Ligand binder design. Structure first.
Ligand SMILES: CN(C)CCCn1ccc2cc(-c3nc(S(C)(=O)=O)nc4[nH]ccc34)ccc21
Length: 108
């Protein structure tokens, strides 16, 4: 996908902030605390979270949209692999990803 422009980055900031503000997003705001998730970091080999993505956005880490979508998608894949499908954490990923899709389409 095409190189991110400066205006692109403003839209990414906006998408990121919308996700950070969502009621269901609290489990993903910061790196998982291993006290809150037993053996999380033995299970999950590529952790990701919204504070880590915000750092990357601020530093202009992303060069194409697909890299941004990749990190976001890691957040939901991680949660759904680590937790069972009836968990409330799993549902939090269901809700937030569909919101991300809605916002991503708006971004393009
Ligand atoms: C520091 N702590 C002592 C107080 C803060 C409370 N708190 C803040 C975020 C958060 C996330 C989980 C969690 N997150 C996920 S995740 C990212 O995969 O959706 N899966 C899980 N399974 C079981 C638990 C759990 C649990 C508690 C949490």
């Amino acid at each position: 996908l095409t190189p991110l422009t400066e205006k692109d980055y403003e839209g990414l900031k906006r998408v990121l902030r919308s996700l950070q503000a969502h009621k269901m997003a609290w489990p993903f705001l910061e790196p998982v605390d291993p006290n809150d998730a037993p053996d999380y970091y033995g299970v999950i080999k590529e952790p990701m979270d919204l504070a880590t993505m915000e750092e990357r956005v601020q530093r202009r880490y992303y060069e194409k949209l697909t890299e941004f979508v990749a990190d976001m998608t890691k957040i939901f894949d991680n949660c759904r692999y680590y937790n069972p499908s009836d968990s409330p954490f799993y549902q939090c990923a269901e809700v937030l990803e569909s919101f991300f899709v809605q916002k991503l389409k708006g971004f393009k």
